[PDB]
Amino acid sequence: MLQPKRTKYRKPHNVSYEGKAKGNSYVAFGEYGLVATKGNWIDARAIESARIAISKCLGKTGKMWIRIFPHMSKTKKPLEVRMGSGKGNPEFWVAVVKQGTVMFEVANIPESQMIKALTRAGHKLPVTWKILKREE
Amino acid sequence: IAKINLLGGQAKPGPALASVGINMGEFTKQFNEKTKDKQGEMIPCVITAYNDKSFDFILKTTPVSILLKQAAKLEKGAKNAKTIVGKITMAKAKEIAQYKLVDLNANTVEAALKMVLGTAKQMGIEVI
Amino acid sequence: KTGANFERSVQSIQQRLGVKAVPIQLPIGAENDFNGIIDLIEEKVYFFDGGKEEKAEEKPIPDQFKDQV
Amino acid sequence: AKKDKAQQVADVSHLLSTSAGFVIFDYTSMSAIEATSIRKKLFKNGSKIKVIKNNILRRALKAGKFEGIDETAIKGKLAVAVGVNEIVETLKAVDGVVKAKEAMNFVCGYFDNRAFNSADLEKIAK
Amino acid sequence: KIGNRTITLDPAKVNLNFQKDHIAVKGPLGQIELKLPPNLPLKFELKDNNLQITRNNELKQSKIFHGTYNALITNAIIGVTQGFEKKLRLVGVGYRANVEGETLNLQLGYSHPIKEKIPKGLTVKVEKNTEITISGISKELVGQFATEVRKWRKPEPYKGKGVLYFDEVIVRKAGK
Amino acid sequence: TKADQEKMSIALSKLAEEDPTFKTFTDPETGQTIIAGMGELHLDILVDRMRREFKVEVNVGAPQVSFRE
Amino acid sequence: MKVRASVKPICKDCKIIKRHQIVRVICKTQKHKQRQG
Amino acid sequence: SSRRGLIEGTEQRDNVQVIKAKVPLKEMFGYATDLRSFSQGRGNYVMQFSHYAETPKSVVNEIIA
RNA sequence: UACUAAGUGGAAAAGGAUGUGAAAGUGCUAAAACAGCAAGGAUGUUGGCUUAGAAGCAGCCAUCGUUUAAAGAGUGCGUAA
RNA sequence: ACCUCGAUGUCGACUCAUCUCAUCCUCGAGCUGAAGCAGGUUCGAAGGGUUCGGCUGUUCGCCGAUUAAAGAGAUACGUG
């Protein structure tokens, strides 16, 4: 789904996400936030699914910001072929989730509806969802 | 036992008094010879089963929420909070309050006026 | 048939109409044991030949239903 | 809570100590339409008709001109009939509410400060 | 809760004999025995014209057992001094009932005739053949007997036809 | 089929005298038969009369209304 | 009933019950019951 | 009520109650089958003419293909 | 010395749960809180738009006043209003 | 490609079957926008059994007669 319109390199290593939280692990603009539990790979398809689900349950006045992006691309070898003969080929773009980072923030919506929307979104993404209130 | 928004003249319209157990004419004669001055508006009436509904009848003058429009020279209000168009004069306010006094159990004219201004919000009108 | 009775029928015939119709003959028992008739003017009558009724045998009124006449 | 309880106790105790004519009864099953009708009967009087809690009434009677707690906090329904200074229109309301029920069983209070039982209060009412 | 609730007793009409296996309660309405597991934690105190049972120890299992035994004694007393009655209505086209000896036979639309053995200790009253009155002192056994009677026929939602409890009323269902 | 319609006209003519209170209209805008009856079984017996003696069998359609403008 | 892996109350009468150490839900409405979690 | 009618009221006669309402003539065919299915052959219908009215949205599209 | 009532032990995921117990504080209460019971739970109000009278309650909506301890154009059911 | 390439003769078919249950019928139950009849969902249940023909080396596939029902896999797509 989401994708930069120009990338210098085509076949980079995917990630080594093991460690602690990095980057956005707290709410910046939104009043409620989704925080994961373990680092994995997520495809832009699931991210878009979660976002559209939120927007569908989102009010016309509420606003949301995404704190992640499919920065890297997925690379798998084609089907039923032997091992070797160079690397694979690029595929759909993939975002990496670290340990306990925050990836979506929402604001301007009744708090119960906020929790409902976050719970709705959390079942699309492989990581384990957790809710956080605005911690200024 | 039921609640009826009966007419002011005859008592035929409304399938809530033709299936209670009282002859139509037997009560319509008294309703026409007693409520002759109160014909021309939907007037609620109260009935109850005592043996077969042969007695225990009372009138309730029309509520001041659709009359309120006509009382303040407004043709029709609205369903939501709408623009202020109508206004009832003070003398007409006392007249309406003392006409409703029969209907209400309110202990003073001010209580009735407060009730009317409480229901005077679905049409954007001022009762004073 | 299963679900029929005499007293209920002879009450409902007047509950719905009220023509004051009153039975003359008396059916024996109910649905399954109905094989004879007690007339108000004639004595007991019984039906012997099943499958094809051709003879009606008259018999005196017994004790228990005598008052029933 | 206890604070609101005590504040209302003090307020109602003062209100009842100021007044002299105050009688309560247990006549049972009072209804809101019956309450409205009997209030129409008591409309002339500033007398209030209601039922107040038992602890507050018991403390009001403790500060209440021949205290007695056996019936102001016990004995079921406690229907409050307080006519301040004049309890004549309140007496009319009492008569009306006696008519509203099968009979009158006087519980507590009196017509200005000398507690008498139902042997004469029924005659006083009618 | 109900463990602190009073347990009204009448020794002049009811004798309560404590056998650790079966408590024997005897009254003008008969005699009942309570089969109990060994070493019930609850302690029983009998006053003048009253009884009250508590738990010697404090435990979740003991907490449940306190209310359980309090309820058992309460229902036993109510049965032995007042009794229990259950009223049933058999609504149907031609569904009737009769009782012979200690066995209740039915008249249903079933091709196979329907009968039900009645155990001792309970009395069946059939004034109308559509009305059943089960009287006893054993509430649990009365309920069980009613359930065993109703397993052949229960009120259908598509048309009320079965054993109503004189209060069991549901919403009308009709595909037609 | 128009031949079956022509024979059906004669069939209605031959069945009208059977019940003078049986009604058949002929709409001017749509010159087709308009049957009337006392319910479902009435239509069944009429269609049986058409399809047995006259051997003309017709499928039910839908009524038409004047629908002024 | 409905065999599920996650059960939530549907109406006020829908109570999470446990029979024979088996978690189910109960309700007088016949469209709400489930079983086995 | 389940048919969006206009029950003007009910008159009383010797042994019956008669609802005076309005039903479209298009919506009038087959009413006897439902009346029997709702009154078990005892309810009866009288279909008189009082006035015309604008057809609903269904008829205006039924007329033109 | 506690936890455990699954034999966890003796394989296990999302997710679900008045799970068991403990800790940290958070509301009250013996002046009887709360559960239940004898009850009360009214008056404009069939408020009108919509729609039959849809109008305590097909739906919409301002929706506040009055007696009062307490009552909502009613918490729902339920209905033709 | 880690035993086997100094040895596992391999596919379909016949005979002979067997094991398991993610259960086809027969069995039962719960519920249903299931009036009944005709239904559907889910569960328990492996006790039993579950065709013959035309095309074709062929499984499959298509058709016909059907049959209460013509299950899903494995036992080296069993069986030299």
UniProtKB/Swiss-Prot annotation, chain A:
GO terms for biological process: translation. Keywords: Ribonucleoprotein, Ribosomal protein, RNA-binding, rRNA-binding, tRNA-binding. It comes from the Bacteria. Belongs to the universal ribosomal protein uL16 family. HAMAP family: Ribosomal_uL16. Part of the 50S ribosomal subunit. This is Large ribosomal subunit protein uL16. The lineage of its organism: Bacteria, Bacillati, Mycoplasmatota, Mycoplasmoidales, Mycoplasmoidaceae. The gene is rplP.
Curated annotation (Swiss-Prot), chain F:
The gene is fusA. Belongs to the TRAFAC class translation factor GTPase superfamily. Classic translation factor GTPase family. EF-G/EF-2 subfamily. It comes from Mycoplasma pneumoniae (strain ATCC 29342 / M129 / Subtype 1) (Mycoplasmoides pneumoniae). This is Elongation factor G. It comes from the Bacteria. Catalyzes the GTP-dependent ribosomal translocation step during translation elongation. During this step, the ribosome changes from the pre-translocational (PRE) to the post-translocational (POST) state as the newly formed A-site-bound peptidyl-tRNA and P-site-bound deacylated tRNA move to the P and E sites, respectively. Catalyzes the coordinated movement of the two tRNA molecules, the mRNA and conformational changes in the ribosome. It is found in: Cytoplasm.
UniProtKB/Swiss-Prot annotation, chain G:
Keywords: Ribonucleoprotein, Ribosomal protein. Pfam families: Ribosomal_L36. The keyword Metal-binding does not apply. The keyword Ribosomal protein applies. GO terms for biological process: translation. HAMAP family: Ribosomal_bL36. It comes from the Bacteria. GO terms for molecular function: structural constituent of ribosome. Belongs to the bacterial ribosomal protein bL36 family. GO terms for cellular component: cytoplasm; ribonucleoprotein complex; ribosome. Signal peptide: none annotated. InterPro entries: Ribosomal_bL36, Ribosomal_bL36_sp. The gene is rpmJ. This is Large ribosomal subunit protein bL36.
Swiss-Prot record, chain H:
It comes from the Bacteria. The chain holds residues 621 to 685 of 688 of the full protein. The lineage of its organism: Bacteria, Bacillati, Mycoplasmatota, Mycoplasmoidales, Mycoplasmoidaceae. Belongs to the TRAFAC class translation factor GTPase superfamily. Classic translation factor GTPase family. EF-G/EF-2 subfamily. This is Elongation factor G. It is found in: Cytoplasm. It comes from Mycoplasma pneumoniae (strain ATCC 29342 / M129 / Subtype 1) (Mycoplasmoides pneumoniae). Catalyzes the GTP-dependent ribosomal translocation step during translation elongation. During this step, the ribosome changes from the pre-translocational (PRE) to the post-translocational (POST) state as the newly formed A-site-bound peptidyl-tRNA and P-site-bound deacylated tRNA move to the P and E sites, respectively. Catalyzes the coordinated movement of the two tRNA molecules, the mRNA and conformational changes in the ribosome.
